[PDB]
């Protein structure tokens, strides 16, 4: 079943392309489609209510990791659901594109790894208990 690393790279590659960037510039590294589409819908819902994530973030190379973990820990503090996992991908995507915009491209491959490891260590058990990524595809369509 699904390599989380692969998922992260696919999602981030997509979100970077939406900002005119190529994944290969910064990195030498049905589920994928559902996640891309869900990310687009999530971001539409987000900007209907709030400001684009890329506008809200305050990034520095020295605090990027700490910033990433604080956001993700609060996002999942009182539980996990598929919508929050989509939020997690969208946040990582926003963090990457903003990193590039702010001339901190070094962070792109790091953020992808932070995401992959958080998925593998902290979200994967829940994903398994909820039927795997196939469940997400069937729910989203």
């Amino acid at each position: 079943s699904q390599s989380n690393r692969e998922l992260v790279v696919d999602f981030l590659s997509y979100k970077l392309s939406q900002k005119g960037y190529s994944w290969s510039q910064f990195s030498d590294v049905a589920v994928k489609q559902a996640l891309r589409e869900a990310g687009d819908e999530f971001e539409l819902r987000y900007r209907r209510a709030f400001s684009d994530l890329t506008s809200q973030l305050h990034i520095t190379p020295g605090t990027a990791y700490q910033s990433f973990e604080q956001v993700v820990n609060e996002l999942f503090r009182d539980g996990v659901n598929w919508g929050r996992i989509v939020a997690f991908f969208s946040f990582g995507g926003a963090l990457c594109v903003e990193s590039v915009d702010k001339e901190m491209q070094v962070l792109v491959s790091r953020i992808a790894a932070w995401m992959a490891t958080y998925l593998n260590d902290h979200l994967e058990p829940w994903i398994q208990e909820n039927g795997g990524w196939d469940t997400f595809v069937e729910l989203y369509g």
Binding site: E41, Y46, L57, V71, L75, N81, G83, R84, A87, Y140
Partner: peptide, 21 residues
């Protein structure tokens, strides 16, 4: 703003989740 961002992500996440539940 980390906590603020996470709270907004969570709210839209839960809205998203409820729609496709």
């Amino acid at each position: 703003p980390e906590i603020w961002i996470a709270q907004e992500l969570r709210r839209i996440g839960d809205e998203f989740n409820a729609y496709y539940a």
